[PDB]
Amino acid sequence: ALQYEQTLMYGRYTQGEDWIFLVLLGLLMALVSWVMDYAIAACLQAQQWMSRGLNTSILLQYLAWVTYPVVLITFSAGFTQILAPQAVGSGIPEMKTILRGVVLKEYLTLKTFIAKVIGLTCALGSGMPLGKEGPFVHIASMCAALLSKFLSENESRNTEMLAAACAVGVGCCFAAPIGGVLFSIEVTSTFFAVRNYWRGFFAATFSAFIFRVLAVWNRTALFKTRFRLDFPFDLQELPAFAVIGIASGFGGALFVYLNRKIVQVMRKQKTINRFLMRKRLLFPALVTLLISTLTFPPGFGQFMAGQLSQKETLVTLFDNRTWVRSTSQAWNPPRANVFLTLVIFILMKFWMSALATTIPVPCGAFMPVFVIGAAFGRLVGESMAAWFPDGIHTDSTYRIVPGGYAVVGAAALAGAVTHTVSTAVIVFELTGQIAHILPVMIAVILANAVAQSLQPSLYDSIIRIKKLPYLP
Amino acid sequence: ALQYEQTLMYGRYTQGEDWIFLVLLGLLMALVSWVMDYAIAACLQAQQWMSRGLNTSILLQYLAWVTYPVVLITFSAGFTQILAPQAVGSGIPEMKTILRGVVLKEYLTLKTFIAKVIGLTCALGSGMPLGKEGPFVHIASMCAALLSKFLSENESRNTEMLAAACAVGVGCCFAAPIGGVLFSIEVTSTFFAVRNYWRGFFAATFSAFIFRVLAVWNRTALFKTRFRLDFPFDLQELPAFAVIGIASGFGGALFVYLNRKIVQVMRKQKTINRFLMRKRLLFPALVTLLISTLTFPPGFGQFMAGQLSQKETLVTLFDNRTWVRSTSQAWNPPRANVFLTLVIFILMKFWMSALATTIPVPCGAFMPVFVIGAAFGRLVGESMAAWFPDGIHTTYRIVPGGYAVVGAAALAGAVTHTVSTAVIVFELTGQIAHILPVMIAVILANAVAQSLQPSLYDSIIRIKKLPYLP
Ligand SMILES: [Cl-]
Ligand SMILES: [Cl-]
Secondary structure: OEEEEOOOOOOEEEOOHHHHHHHHHHHHHHHHHHHHHHHHHHHHHHHHHHHHOOOOOHHHHHHHHHHHHHHHHHHHHHHHHHHOHHHOEOOHHHHHHHHOOOOEOOOOOHHHHHHHHHHHHHHHHOOOOOEOHHHHHHHHHHHHHHHHHHOOOHHHHHHHHHHHHHHHHHHHHHOOHHHHHHHHHHHHOOEEEHHHHHHHHHHHHHHHHHHHHHOOOOOOOOOOOOOOOOOOOOHHHHHHHHHHHHHHHHHHHHHHHHHHHHHHHHHHOOHHHHHHOOOOOHHHHHHHHHHHHHOOOOOHHHHHOOOOOHHHHHHHHOOOOOOOOOOHHHHOOOOOOHHHHHHHHHHHHHHHHHHHOOOOOEOEOHHHHHHHHHHHHHHHHHHHHHHOOOOOOOOOOOOOOHHHHHHHHHHHHHHHHHOOOOHHHHHHHHHOOOOOHHHHHHHHHHHHHHHOOOOOOHHHHHHHHOOOOOOO | OEEEEOOOOOOEEEOOHHHHHHHHHHHHHHHHHHHHHHHHHHHHHHHHHHHHHOOOOHHHHHHHHHHHHHHHHHHHHHHHHHHOHHHOEOOHHHHHHHHOOOOEOOOOOHHHHHHHHHHHHHHHHOOOOOEOHHHHHHHHHHHHHHHHHHOOOOOOHHHHHHHHHHHHHHHHHHOOOOHHHHHHHHHHOOEEEHHHHHHHHHHHHHHHHHHHHHHHHOOOOOOOOOOOOOOOOOHHHHHHHHHHHHHHHHHHHHHHHHHHHHHHHHHHOHHHHHHHHHOOOHHHHHHHHHHHHHHOOOOHHHHHOOOOOHHHHHHHHOOOOOOOOOOOHHHOOOOOOHHHHHHHHHHHHHHHHHHHOOOOOEOEOHHHHHHHHHHHHHHHHHHHHHHOOOOOOOOOOOOHHHHHHHHHHHHHHHHHOOOOHHHHHHHHHOOOOOHHHHHHHHHHHHHHHHOOOOOHHHHHHHHOOOOOOO
16 A cells, blocks of 8 residues: 655555445535535635725735735645645546555545545635646545445445546536546546446436536526537638647647646755745745736736636637627737737746646646637637638638637647547537537547647646556 | 358358558548448439329329339348348447457458448338448448558457447448447447547547538538527426436337347248248348338328438427427328327337348348437427426426437437437537436436346347357
């Protein structure tokens, strides 16, 4: 068996009843997922309230803007450090190792569950560039471990039990039942049984039903698009969706390389590392103060749409309107233009997300890279709509739709970081439409073919950083 | 290697180079699939040209109606026995056996390819209730085998090339690039590498690109629906979509049992089996004459929409209109109503498809059971829309064509033991608005069917005496 060792970032490792189980697994992870999302929304509304409540100086608005996220990230790192140090980072590298028959000593205990749920809520409620896909795979796996201990060779049934929980975790994260099952298979395994695809599809369907009940009866796609079904794209637009796929493959390989290079450079410093490992809370507080200072809207933040939340940013990039011809006018500052505001957002969010993904809190990385791909897809789509203002064809009614290039760019960059093709299925379930299926599949295959030639996936790069037993 | 043996019905058996390959495999199966769909549409247009001319009397109309399909099926059966007897039936049971490392003597040869392509074109050019999912899995596997011999660790590379070919064949059959990859994995394997799911998705994307070019050079979704995006179904309707799944579970198990029972009765009836074996073409001709006599429109065919083609039938069932308040007209003859015509269609097409899939021709079974499920779904949707005329909530109305999409996916899932018929139904219709109803019905249909019977493809492995593992 292996046991956890702390360092400043990720740390290291050292040294019938089945229907009942899958229905109760689907019920628990939907209730736990709904409670976490309610508490994250309440934290983001409190930042808006304390900001909106005052106008006396730009200095008081600045101190309110930077203090709130630094306090939430300091509490997240410190509370996680006291209860369960093994709860920092994403959960996918460890669950991939546990399903391979390796034992990690205290990874699925009740203290680790309490450290994940409280630590993830404070990390996401700050507004830092953080995701939740990996943390949800570990929280679902702890629901399964505790539920199978309650519902009292069984090691094979344990592996069978944890694999269905990994499928439920991703499905609850995106509200995407089929794409979540298929993505969990691509990231947690190398060969997978058709039986465990059926057990995953069964449990994800019951969670989708509990979300549909909670969403209407006691108060659907998360980012609903409204594109036309008649001629959404021309045959002559296909070369541009192929450029998005190739450029996403080079960008997704660069992201994984940058995230590893940030970890390797601080492990090599003598005095800096030996100081910060005594001053444990100083590194997460300094990174949060840097990022929060640059997103401050009255200063530099207006040139990168810094006033939008992670949800509002993605709701605007997918809109059914052409900008070159909480609202889409955040991309159009008085002293700038749409093209410059997209280019600055892409360059700033790229290094901010690679840095924030390394701090010692519970966090994932999928939505951070998905939103960078959506902005790059808008940059190409608005550029096409500025070059062809009366449409791409001479015949002459149907104009270009830049929001459909954003959907393609989101799926292509996330596929190149994770080394998955099932981001295509996730993007149809997130948007509630399947009209861009050929553009999406072309871009996703080009992004994977380019990225796998350059780098490992994000999750395989983390396994090598943590010194876990590696199957290449 | 196992050797093939003839019988009245199914027969028996007795004792960067990877990118260049996947591009050419995706191209060839798209070109072959296009040439076949063109030839089948030309055969179905010639039946209309005979019918529009021969209006002199009911007798000249009847003789035109039954002679055309009896000639095409008799030629399909006769041509297959002369050239390659092993080409009859599906293709999935046999590829599932070849992927487990068994050798079948001549199954991927050029004479088998010619017999499969010409024989399936003539079988589907008749109005018979036949499919092509299995035949296209065999034709795609013959494209991959003939590619692998044209452009050259000799073992296992071929087994991975045949795994990608199974995915391309199902993807070209439905024009459904993701759902065809996932369905081929469920029906041909128990464990599949993530690396071969990527190889299938790559080759299927290139076939979809070549179809998009061909649809602009000559002339998004095969059965494109047009339902509203705002409240297409209510929370109170989920119990009706669940009853579709449970009823499709028993109906999908009954289809597999009846198909086996017909084959076992003929094998045991030794007095008839010896006589028909001296005269092998008599069996497909008399089944085709029986089916065509009942589908003849001026007779009994009125009461089961017998004047529609298989494509027109599915386009009428999936439309955005409510019939109780061609798309209504063929289902609403002057002597009856739409409910009675849906019930007679379901009960007649059930035994006709179970019988027709046993005859000595290249044929599949997916579109035959998908069309029965679509009608059973329409019956529940039109009954809900008749019971709740102002809508179910105290004021959007019910969409009967959305229940047809659920029933089509659920019955085809229960016959094949698959869940990927959900992904296939979104790619065939070009909408994903019914995803929760579809998944509820498909999971309920699978849990009921797997408790009662094997899959259709596992049942054929047992009938043909092939190597089996439950
Ligand atoms: Cl996320
Ligand atoms: Cl078919």
